[PDB]
Design an enzyme around this catalytic site. Structure first.
Site, short mmCIF file in Angstrom:
data_model
loop_
_atom_site.label_atom_id
_atom_site.label_comp_id
_atom_site.label_asym_id
_atom_site.label_seq_id
_atom_site.Cartn_x
_atom_site.Cartn_y
_atom_site.Cartn_z
N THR A 18 0.95 -1.26 0.05
CA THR A 18 0.06 -0.01 0.02
C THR A 18 0.91 1.42 0.06
OG1 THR A 18 -0.44 0.27 2.50
CG2 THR A 18 -2.10 -1.25 1.30
N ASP A 45 -1.44 -4.85 3.17
CA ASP A 45 -0.23 -4.42 4.20
C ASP A 45 -0.10 -2.82 4.34
OD1 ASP A 45 2.38 -5.43 5.56
OD2 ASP A 45 3.22 -3.56 4.46
N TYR A 50 3.32 5.14 6.79
CA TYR A 50 2.92 5.28 5.27
C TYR A 50 1.83 6.27 4.97
CZ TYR A 50 4.87 0.44 4.90
OH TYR A 50 5.60 -0.71 4.71
N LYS A 79 2.22 -1.63 11.35
CA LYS A 79 3.39 -1.59 11.90
C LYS A 79 3.76 -0.87 12.90
CE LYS A 79 4.94 -3.43 7.50
NZ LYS A 79 4.32 -2.54 6.22
N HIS A 112 8.28 -2.65 13.02
CA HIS A 112 8.61 -2.18 11.57
C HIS A 112 10.01 -2.45 11.25
CE1 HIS A 112 6.99 0.75 8.32
NE2 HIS A 112 7.79 -0.09 7.76
N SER A 149 9.77 -6.92 11.65
CA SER A 149 10.04 -6.79 10.13
C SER A 149 11.54 -6.23 10.31
CB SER A 149 8.91 -5.58 9.77
OG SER A 149 9.40 -5.48 8.26
N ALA A 201 9.57 -7.26 -3.40
CA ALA A 201 9.76 -8.45 -4.36
C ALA A 201 9.53 -8.22 -5.94
CB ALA A 201 8.46 -9.60 -3.92
N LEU A 202 9.26 -6.97 -6.25
CA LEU A 202 9.10 -6.41 -7.58
C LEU A 202 10.48 -5.53 -7.90
CD1 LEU A 202 5.32 -6.41 -8.56
CD2 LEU A 202 7.06 -8.17 -8.71
N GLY A 203 11.28 -5.21 -6.83
CA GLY A 203 12.54 -4.56 -7.16
C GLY A 203 12.51 -3.28 -6.36
N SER A 254 0.83 -1.93 -6.31
CA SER A 254 0.85 -1.37 -7.84
C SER A 254 -0.41 -0.40 -7.36
CB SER A 254 0.68 -2.26 -8.79
OG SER A 254 0.31 -1.56 -9.81
N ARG A 261 -4.58 -5.88 -11.28
CA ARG A 261 -5.35 -7.34 -12.06
C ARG A 261 -4.39 -8.31 -12.22
NH1 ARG A 261 -10.82 -6.23 -12.22
NH2 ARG A 261 -11.38 -4.10 -12.17
N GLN A 262 -3.29 -8.13 -12.95
CA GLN A 262 -2.13 -8.91 -13.59
C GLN A 262 -1.67 -9.72 -12.43
OE1 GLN A 262 2.34 -8.60 -14.94
NE2 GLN A 262 0.89 -7.52 -16.35
N1 LIG Z 1 8.48 -3.35 6.24
C1 LIG Z 1 9.38 -2.47 5.56
O1 LIG Z 1 10.33 -2.17 5.87
C2 LIG Z 1 8.71 -2.65 3.99
C3 LIG Z 1 9.52 -1.91 3.06
C4 LIG Z 1 9.18 -1.86 1.63
C5 LIG Z 1 8.09 -2.24 1.35
N2 LIG Z 1 7.34 -2.62 2.20
C6 LIG Z 1 5.68 -3.06 1.96
O2 LIG Z 1 5.85 -4.02 0.90
C7 LIG Z 1 5.06 -3.44 -0.05
C8 LIG Z 1 5.72 -3.64 -1.44
O3 LIG Z 1 7.07 -3.23 -1.79
P1 LIG Z 1 7.32 -1.98 -2.82
O4 LIG Z 1 6.41 -0.76 -2.26
O5 LIG Z 1 8.69 -1.84 -2.37
O6 LIG Z 1 7.02 -2.25 -4.30
P2 LIG Z 1 7.36 -3.64 -4.90
O7 LIG Z 1 5.98 -4.57 -4.70
O8 LIG Z 1 8.46 -4.00 -5.01
O9 LIG Z 1 6.84 -2.90 -6.46
C9 LIG Z 1 7.69 -1.90 -7.14
C10 LIG Z 1 7.02 -1.45 -8.49
O10 LIG Z 1 6.70 -2.44 -9.19
C11 LIG Z 1 5.46 -2.15 -10.03
N3 LIG Z 1 4.69 -3.12 -10.30
C12 LIG Z 1 3.60 -3.81 -9.68
N4 LIG Z 1 3.12 -4.85 -10.60
C13 LIG Z 1 3.94 -4.84 -11.60
C14 LIG Z 1 3.76 -5.51 -12.69
N5 LIG Z 1 2.80 -6.66 -13.09
N6 LIG Z 1 4.29 -5.31 -13.77
C15 LIG Z 1 5.45 -4.08 -13.86
N7 LIG Z 1 5.54 -3.48 -12.40
C16 LIG Z 1 4.69 -3.97 -11.47
C17 LIG Z 1 4.69 -1.25 -9.07
O11 LIG Z 1 4.59 0.20 -9.95
P3 LIG Z 1 3.20 0.58 -10.24
O12 LIG Z 1 2.47 1.22 -8.83
O13 LIG Z 1 3.48 1.91 -11.46
O14 LIG Z 1 2.10 -0.51 -11.07
C18 LIG Z 1 5.78 -0.62 -8.08
O15 LIG Z 1 6.05 0.92 -7.81
C19 LIG Z 1 5.31 -1.96 -0.05
O16 LIG Z 1 4.06 -1.33 -0.75
C20 LIG Z 1 4.69 -1.86 1.56
O17 LIG Z 1 3.44 -2.31 1.91
C21 LIG Z 1 7.54 -2.86 3.79
O1 LIG Z 2 7.98 0.82 4.89
C1 LIG Z 2 8.95 1.67 4.50
N1 LIG Z 2 8.64 2.25 3.42
C2 LIG Z 2 7.70 1.56 2.47
C3 LIG Z 2 8.14 1.33 0.98
O2 LIG Z 2 8.31 2.74 0.16
C4 LIG Z 2 9.01 3.63 1.15
C5 LIG Z 2 9.63 3.27 2.48
N2 LIG Z 2 9.83 2.11 5.16
C6 LIG Z 2 11.10 2.93 4.76
C7 LIG Z 2 12.50 2.16 4.58
N3 LIG Z 2 12.43 1.33 6.16
C8 LIG Z 2 13.58 0.26 6.08
C9 LIG Z 2 14.15 0.13 7.52
C10 LIG Z 2 14.99 -0.94 7.79
C11 LIG Z 2 15.49 -1.49 6.77
CL1 LIG Z 2 17.01 -2.54 7.01
C12 LIG Z 2 15.47 -1.13 5.35
C13 LIG Z 2 14.30 -0.10 5.08
C14 LIG Z 2 11.80 1.70 7.00
C15 LIG Z 2 10.28 1.48 6.40
#
Ligand SMILES: NC(=O)c1ccc[n+]([C@@H]2O[C@H](COP(=O)([O-])OP(=O)(O)OC[C@H]3O[C@@H](n4cnc5c(N)ncnc54)[C@H](OP(=O)(O)O)[C@@H]3O)[C@@H](O)[C@H]2O)c1
Ligand SMILES: O=C(N1CCOCC1)N1CCN(c2ccc(Cl)cc2)CC1
Length: 306
Positions: A18, A45, A50, A79, A112, A149, A201-203, A254, A261-262
């Site tokens: 999200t 999530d 956020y 979180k 977090h 996390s 997971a998508l980079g 996304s 949807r994909q």
């Molecule tokens: N715990 C933490 O510290 C932490 C850190 C990072 C992320 N997260 C959580 O995990 C979630 C996902 O990770 P993330 O935000 O880093 O993004 P991600 O899932 O790695 O996605 C990266 C980009 O991929 C694109 N995407 C999605 N579906 C696609 C497809 N089928 N083909 C081509 N590109 C596609 C999206 O662009 P578009 O929106 O343009 O489609 C997105 O911006 C976050 O949203 C958050 O909820 C948590």
């Molecule tokens: O959830 C976070 N987001 C959401 C995904 O896009 C931007 C930042 N954050 C910022 C990066 N964060 C982070 C904390 C510890 C490590 Cl090792 C790596 C990243 C904390 C949470």
């Protein structure tokens, strides 16, 4: 499909990511979370960081209200941000996220990050004290499940070996993709009935605040592109499906209607063992989040991992 957590509850193996940066209006978080639920996502999530719980919580409530889903059909995560590690701040932080989301309970609450900050300026807190206060939130019914996390193996062991532990973390949500597949940690978690959940997971979204734009773009990887063509899918789908077949629960953010949807197509096909080895061959220790603001921090998780 769903995976049974180590405290008896269930977690959908595909999760909606999200996060969107500040340049995007808060009102798209509502629109896109509804579309996600409409496409079939059941795990959503979020986090205090956020700044979207109002919107995301309203999206869930809007879909309960129109009869498309029941509350118990949805698995929602928030979180505990790192300014609120001191134990007395834990339950209020959670009651806060609930008031914002206008829900009675989160299904999952996470610490977090292990990198504690003052309530770039660091704090020292005993994370076992923070965890006891997480346990009390489970007893209160505020969080059906609790977890961590961004913890490494040693930081997880600190909790699991704690005197009078009442609840194991159900999960560890960490950065996890073919360029940083976290294999050794993954085996550790599986040995303890703990679930690894993959973010970025998508980079990752390549935010210039934390990510070097010189980093290779995972979704333009030549081996994943070759696999997408073999299977007639997209490199996004190969990267998600890779995670499910390794026993990892995968998030996918996304904010685009077609790609939301994909992404649920990940249930519609399978990769073979040689496909999985090819993807395993891509590991190169690339954590996209690579900033001064974390790296000099006493409890930096990527400090171990050698
Ligand atoms: N715990 C933490 O510290 C932490 C850190 C990072 C992320 N997260 C959580 O995990 C979630 C996902 O990770 P993330 O935000 O880093 O993004 P991600 O899932 O790695 O996605 C990266 C980009 O991929 C694109 N995407 C999605 N579906 C696609 C497809 N089928 N083909 C081509 N590109 C596609 C999206 O662009 P578009 O929106 O343009 O489609 C997105 O911006 C976050 O949203 C958050 O909820 C948590
Ligand atoms: O959830 C976070 N987001 C959401 C995904 O896009 C931007 C930042 N954050 C910022 C990066 N964060 C982070 C904390 C510890 C490590 Cl090792 C790596 C990243 C904390 C949470």
């Amino acid at each position: 499909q769903c995976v049974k957590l180590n405290d008896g509850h269930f977690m959908p193996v595909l999760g909606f990511g999200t996060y969107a940066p500040p340049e995007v209006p808060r009102s798209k978080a509502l629109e896109v979370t509804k579309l996600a639920i409409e496409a079939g996502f059941r795990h959503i999530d979020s986090a205090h960081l956020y700044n979207n719980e109002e919107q995301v919580g309203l999206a869930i409530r809007s879909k309960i209200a129109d009869g498309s889903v029941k509350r118990e059909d949805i698995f929602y995560t928030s979180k505990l941000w790192s300014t609120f590690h001191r134990p007395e701040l834990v339950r209020p932080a959670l009651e806060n996220s609930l008031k914002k989301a206008q829900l009675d309970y989160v299904d999952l609450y996470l610490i977090h990050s292990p990198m504690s900050l003052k309530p770039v300026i660091f704090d020292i807190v005993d994370l076992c004290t923070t965890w006891e206060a997480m346990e009390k939130c489970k007893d209160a019914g505020l969080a059906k499940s609790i977890g961590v996390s961004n913890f490494n193996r040693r930081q997880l062991e600190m909790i699991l070996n704690k005197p009078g532990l009442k609840y194991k973390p159900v999960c560890n949500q960490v950065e996890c993709h073919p360029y940083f597949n976290r294999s050794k940690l993954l085996d550790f978690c599986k040995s303890k009935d703990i679930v690894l959940v993959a973010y970025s997971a998508l980079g990752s979204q390549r935010d210039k605040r934390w990510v070097d734009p010189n980093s290779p773009v995972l979704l333009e990887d030549p081996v994943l592109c070759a696999l997408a063509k073999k299977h007639k899918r997209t490199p996004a789908l190969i990267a998600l499906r890779y995670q499910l077949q390794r026993g990892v629960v995968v998030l996918a953010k996304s904010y685009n209607e077609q790609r939301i949807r994909q992404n649920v197509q990940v249930f519609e096909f399978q990769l073979t063992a040689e496909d999985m080895k090819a993807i395993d061959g891509l590991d190169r220790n690339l954590h996209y989040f690579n900033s001064d603001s974390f790296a000099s921090h006493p409890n930096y998780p990527y400090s171990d991992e050698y």
